[PDB]
Amino acid sequence: MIKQLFTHTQTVTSEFIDHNNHMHDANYNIIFSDVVNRFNYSHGLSLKERENLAYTLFTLEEHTTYLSELSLGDVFTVTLYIYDYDYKRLHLFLTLTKEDGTLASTNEVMMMGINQHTRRSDAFPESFSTQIAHYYKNQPTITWPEQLGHKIAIP
Amino acid sequence: MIKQLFTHTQTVTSEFIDHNNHMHDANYNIIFSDVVNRFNYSHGLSLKERENLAYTLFTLEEHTTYLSELSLGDVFTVTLYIYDYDYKRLHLFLTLTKEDGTLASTNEVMMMGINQHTRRSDAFPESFSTQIAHYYKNQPTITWPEQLGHKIAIP
Numbered sequence: 001m002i003k004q005l006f007t008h009t010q011t012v013t014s015e016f017i018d019h020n021n022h023m024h025d026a027n028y029n030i031i032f033s034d035v036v037n038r039f040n041y042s043h044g045l046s047l048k049e050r051e052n053l054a055y056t057l058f059t060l061e062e063h064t065t066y067l068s069e070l071s072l073g074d075v076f077t078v079t080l081y082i083y084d085y086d087y088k089r090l091h092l093f094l095t096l097t098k099e100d101g102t103l104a105s106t107n108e109v110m111m112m113g114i115n116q117h118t119r120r121s122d123a124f125p126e127s128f129s130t131q132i133a134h135y136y137k138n139q140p141t142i143t144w145p146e147q148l149g150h151k152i153a154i155p
Numbered sequence: 156m157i158k159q160l161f162t163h164t165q166t167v168t169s170e171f172i173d174h175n176n177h178m179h180d181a182n183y184n185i186i187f188s189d190v191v192n193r194f195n196y197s198h199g200l201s202l203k204e205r206e207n208l209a210y211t212l213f214t215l216e217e218h219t220t221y222l223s224e225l226s227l228g229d230v231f232t233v234t235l236y237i238y239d240y241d242y243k244r245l246h247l248f249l250t251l252t253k254e255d256g257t258l259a260s261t262n263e264v265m266m267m268g269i270n271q272h273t274r275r276s277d278a279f280p281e282s283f284s285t286q287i288a289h290y291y292k293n294q295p296t297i298t299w300p301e302q303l304g305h306k307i308a309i310p
Binding site: 091 | 202205213224240304
């Protein structure tokens, strides 16, 4: 009945602004990465848990789209969705929106679980796997934006 | 006869390293963005030229792949290729390789030219367009990596 979304809100500061007088492209990636980490830290793989379990997550692949510029002082929210997952991979889709609801940017990311003894991929620990399944189950249906899965191409 | 590639080499420093003890995912994007800018600055759109022409370039879309980890002290090179271009868009593909030749990361990016009076898209100025065409013409054929155009998906 009550669906839930992990979000993080913040404001565009001076240090994020480029010579085009808006937020620099790579700063979007810095943000998205940090929100992903906040999520994973709160869903079974905090840094302490990673040390105890000898387990971590590596980024494999990501796709970022820049739809609408963000200026100095703009307050924005990042929202995380789980698009897909399996026994050792997480396929995430994040939106970055302005206060009025304008989709400013999107990020699609594939992460993979890694056994720290071997630095080879391996199944998620059960606590993480449970928490991920629960989040996905309990997340709002969304009409997936056309950015999702989009191939880069000159029209 | 003599083909040419724009490149930039640097070393992994402490500030790039995450809690996984390798270069943080988003730092790859910071690097790739800066190399793209170095290229554009040297091919007809330096900051001075952008001010004189009232013209700039915005990032629209990018895709980054993380293939092989980079550690503290690792020396790497970024190489820029033009995959495609039209009258106001540039479709780039960059490789990031270790000294032995190991493909560590790839970046595919779409940039678009912007008229600064209107902040609307518009054809590249001729000097930039000429320089871009020449670079593409004079660049080595490469067997395009399977990363290029790759859609994110759990197998």
